[PDB]
Symmetry: C2
Subunit: 173 residues, 2 copies
């Protein structure tokens, strides 16, 4: 794995300088006797990607009380907030692929949706599509804010698009 004290420090610096200004040399200048090394920046951002979810993605895993709508909705809501908790959250996540630990739990997501009446390809599609929508929505929210140096709510807009998405999936539950 890799130490928490180090990850916390990188997250906090990320809030200061965003992804573009975040480097491992600057990470060390923040910290200065337990050893750490990242294979490269991308590796740092993969770790932060994972950390963001560990800390905030709270209806990631299913629960007896869930039904399919309530899980995907909550799941999307919860993903989104993990992305929004940190500067450049969405950008960082892009192109990441869920890990070995994230795989076991990501297999639970499926075996629930199949349980509930979706086909295999439909279930992958429900997760990806929600995923693509969310990253998209957050990216636009985060950049619009981030770029302001040069109407009714990004939460509404998200919440709506997600409502539409859940309907079109219901057409094959």
């Amino acid at each position: 794995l890799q130490p928490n004290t180090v990850i916390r420090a990188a997250l906090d610096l990320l809030n200061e300088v965003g992804v573009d200004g975040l480097t491992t040399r600057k990470l060390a200048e923040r910290l200065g006797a337990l050893y750490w090394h990242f294979r490269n920046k991308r590796a740092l951002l993969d770790a932060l990607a994972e950390a963001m979810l560990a800390e905030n993605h709270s209806t990631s895993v299913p629960r007896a009380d869930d039904d399919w709508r309530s899980f995907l909705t909550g799941n999307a809501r919860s993903f989104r907030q993990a992305l929004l908790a940190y500067r450049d959250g969405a950008r960082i996540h892009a192109g990441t692929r869920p890990g070995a630990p994230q795989m076991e739990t990501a297999d639970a997501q499926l075996r629930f949706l199949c349980e509930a009446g979706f086909s295999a390809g439909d279930a992958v599609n429900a997760l990806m599509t929600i995923s693509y929508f969310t990253v998209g929505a957050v990216l636009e929210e985060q950049a619009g804010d981030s770029e302001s140096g040069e109407e009714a709510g990004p939460d509404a807009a998200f919440e709506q698009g997600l409502a539409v998405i859940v309907d079109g999936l219901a057409k094959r539950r």
Copy 2:
């Protein structure tokens, strides 16, 4: 506005170095007697954002032969390809807001969907949501590729999520 020879040169350099390596000083080192200036990088990326669409967003505007499904579908397909034509296309677009010229044509999109049976808030939601989904989908495609230094198709995956999206909107045409 701002000169085409200059924009072409910036697009071509963008393909070489992505957004992170693109700066106005490097743009000039590419060119070196007609004058140009960008207020800042963000302004450069706003112009490139617009150029990408001017060049490739081909079922942006409606047409008598369109119906609503075929327009939103095509529209999304066409947007997406504009984003994919250039490195970091999606990232660049994030946070941009369609211009004065893009406004007149963006008003045509609506007055078509309202024409076809969507309410006002539904029509905004259809465009945004497709928009958020697309930027999301492309961002993940572009980064996954971009980051490779450290199953069945991103076109399928997009095409599917877009299919689901169009269904959930049909629930209020």
